[PDB]
């Protein structure tokens, strides 16, 4: 502070070093905040600073970085922003970025037709310009804390300038990259900035940065992609862009990596790509060690929807899921039982892993809001299996009385008031288990005393197509067995009349399963085939029948 006028006179000296010496002295003086108010309130100082940034800056990056970092130090406090905006300081950085972008383009086009010494000169010039643009964009980012001035800057072409600055330093990452990506992160909060950002191809430019070693750039890029990924279109662009493989390794390092990996794993192709990554063992490390997380169990549930991921979680012989089910049952973790049900949903040799937990899961499902949810998850896990003996379990566990008690609870109520009941989903799981169980002949003969209950339930619950589809699937599993086939194929069968009525339904799947049962009913009964063909022909030429009745 003892020679401020000396530094101003050095600014008045027309020498490259006489200016930058006083500039760096003023910058190291602004490095402390005590005199920062005294210098921002000095009128003759900042005016000469802005004027020397306007004049000696094109050829002088040695002074335009010092006199910009001084402005950044002034902008570190928001009560001085009005004194900064009272001068045309904010326009200086916008003009500087607008000029240096075109200058960097001219330099990158000059490098392809130049000698070697000029090549190193252009390299050093590009580096100094990167430092200057980093200081300028950091100053604009600190100014943009007021959303009013941020909108005033966005009025001028800004997001395009930031995408250009990102493309500049996209190769040799520098402070310019981190600063422009932080500014784009702050700007991505709004919709118009996001549109101008993704219209200039920002997502691909970000995806072309990985791998990146700098933790700050890593967090900034993953957070900007996190802001981007809440659009329906940007997620496939990242999945097909290869973001998944090099992000799966970051699950143990960064914290936002798991947050992005969940949003990625919401897509099926991301699960197929994660099928061949180490992260499948990382989640099992965090879940089993007790230092788990809700996002971890959620991404583990989304991941186990792929067959390869379920085979990886299951281990080689059963020891993989024997720990997961034990932690799920003992701690009553609904997320882990959800993961176990998603694992059991897969068909193959993996269902033999569940053969040891049939009776325990049925016992949990019989006597257990969270308790009812855990019982529903166990019932869905048991229902997904079809390699189980079933003929033994259906009597050793007394499943028949319990299923008849549950299916009859809520009967004869008209779906209007009773189709939104809490017991309804459990009835759907029971019907699905009866369909998966009735394919075996012994289990079908054991489930035989439930046919009248299924018929009453079919005549009752009709508003939901899925319940009707699963009930007709159970009937189709019953009709294929010769021992109980004729029991349902009486000339005046209520099931046959109901299927004849359902043959012309809006849902395609219900009429698909209905035809799959009707062509069995007509195969073993010629008269039933005639009635089915007559119903089919009266729904396609009925216009001719009506017009000929009107003709008569």
């Amino acid at each position: 502070l003892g020679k401020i006028d000396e530094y101003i006179e050095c600014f008045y000296g027309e020498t490259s070093v006489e200016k930058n010496k006083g500039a760096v002295a003023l910058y190291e003086l602004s490095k402390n905040p005590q005199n920062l108010t005294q210098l921002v309130n000095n009128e003759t100082l900042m005016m000469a600073l802005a004027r020397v940034f306007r004049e000696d800056w094109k050829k002088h990056f040695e002074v335009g970085t010092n006199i910009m970092n001084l402005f950044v130090n002034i902008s570190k406090f928001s009560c001085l922003h009005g004194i900064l905006l009272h001068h045309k300081i904010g326009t200086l950085c916008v003009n500087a970025m607008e000029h240096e972008t075109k200058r960097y383009d001219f330099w990158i086009a000059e490098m392809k037709k130049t000698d070697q010494e000029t090549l190193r000169k252009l390299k050093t010039a590009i580096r100094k310009q990167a430092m200057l643009l980093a200081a300028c964009v950091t100053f604009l980012t600190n100014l943009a804390t007021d959303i009013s001035v941020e909108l005033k800057m966005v009025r001028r072409n800004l997001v395009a300038l930031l995408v250009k600055c990102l493309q500049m330093s996209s190769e040799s990452t520098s402070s310019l990259t981190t600063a422009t990506i932080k500014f784009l992160l702050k700007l991505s909060i709004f919709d118009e900035n996001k549109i101008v950002m993704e219209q200039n191809g920002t997502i691909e430019k970000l995806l072309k940065l990985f791998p990146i070693q700098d933790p700050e750039l890593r967090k900034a890029v993953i957070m900007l992609l996190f802001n981007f990924s809440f659009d329906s279109k940007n997620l496939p662009k990242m999945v097909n862009g290869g973001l998944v493989p090099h992000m799966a390794s970051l699950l143990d390092s960064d914290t936002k990596a798991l947050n992005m990996m969940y949003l990625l794993s919401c897509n099926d192709d991301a699960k197929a790509m994660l099928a061949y990554t180490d992260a499948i063992k990382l989640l099992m490390k965090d879940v089993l060690s007790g230092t788990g997380s809700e996002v971890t169990k959620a991404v583990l549930l989304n991941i186990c929807l792929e067959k390869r991921n379920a085979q990886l979680v299951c281990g080689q012989r059963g020891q993989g899921l024997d720990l997961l089910m034990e932690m799920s049952i003992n701690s009553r973790d609904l997320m882990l039982i959800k993961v176990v049900r998603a694992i059991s949903s897969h068909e193959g040799a993996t269902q033999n892993m569940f053969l040891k937990w049939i009776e325990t899961l049925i016992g949990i499902a019989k006597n257990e809001e969270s308790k009812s949810s855990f019982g529903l998850e166990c019932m869905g896990t048991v229902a997904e299996l079809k390699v189980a003996p079933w003929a033994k379990i259906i009597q050793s566990e007394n499943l028949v009385p319990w299923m008849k008690t549950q299916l009859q609870e809520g009967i004869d109520e008209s779906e209007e008031v009773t189709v939104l009941r809490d017991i309804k989903p459990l009835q759907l799981q029971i019907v699905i288990a009866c369909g998966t169980m009735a394919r075996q002949l012994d289990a079908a003969r054991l489930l035989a005393p439930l046919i009248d209950t299924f018929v009453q339930l079919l005549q009752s619950c009709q508003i939901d197509d899925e319940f009707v589809v699963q009930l007709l699937y159970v009937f189709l599993q019953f009709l294929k067995h010769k021992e109980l086939s004729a029991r349902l194929m009486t000339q005046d069968s209520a099931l046959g009349a109901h299927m004849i009525d359902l043959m012309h339904d809006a849902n395609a799947v219900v009429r698909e399963v209905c035809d799959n049962a009707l062509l069995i009913m007509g195969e073993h009964s010629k008269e039933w085939a005639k009635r089915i063909a007559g119903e089919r022909f009266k729904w396609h030429n009925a216009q001719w029948l009506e017009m000929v009745e009107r003709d008569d």
Partner: protein, 142 residues
């Protein structure tokens, strides 16, 4: 030299009677073909003609899984389940966003009970976007 057989019918070998039989079988074939056309759909006709086997020794044709679901969801979920999920998503879309200038660093990303109880996938629901905070203060000289 060659042997003999019977084929599929005993017709005469006259120059006119065979012509009359040709005219009669073509007259009946016209009616059968139009009845196949207008009444039977293309799907059923293609299926029966692909599942039909013509006989050579005789003169005759011989005309000889997995759980399903609703058109949307992967696993079979009931109607009350999906209806509660849809009303819960409407409630999630009716939420008010955090202010532009407020301390909301914690994204949290809670799992709603409405999704953990019904939805089999995509249970986490994020609350707000990440927002970078500049290093600025209103503190005068220290």
């Amino acid at each position: 030299h060659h042997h003999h057989s019977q084929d599929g019918g005993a017709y005469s070998d006259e120059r006119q009677d065979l012509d009359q039989t040709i005219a009669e079988v073509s007259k009946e074939l016209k009616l059968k073909l139009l009845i196949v056309e207008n009444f039977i759909p293309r799907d059923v006709s293609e299926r029966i003609k692909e599942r039909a086997e013509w006989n050579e020794d005789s003169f005759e044709w011989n005309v000889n899984k997995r759980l399903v679901a609703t058109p949307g969801c992967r696993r079979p979920m009931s109607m009350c389940e999906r209806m509660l999920v849809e009303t819960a998503r409407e409630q999630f879309g009716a939420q008010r966003r955090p202010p532009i200038s407020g301390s909301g660093s914690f994204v949290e990303a809670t799992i709603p009970e409405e999704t953990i109880r019904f939805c089999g996938e995509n249970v986490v629901v994020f609350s707000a976007l990440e927002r970078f905070v500049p290093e600025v203060t209103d503190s005068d000289p220290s």
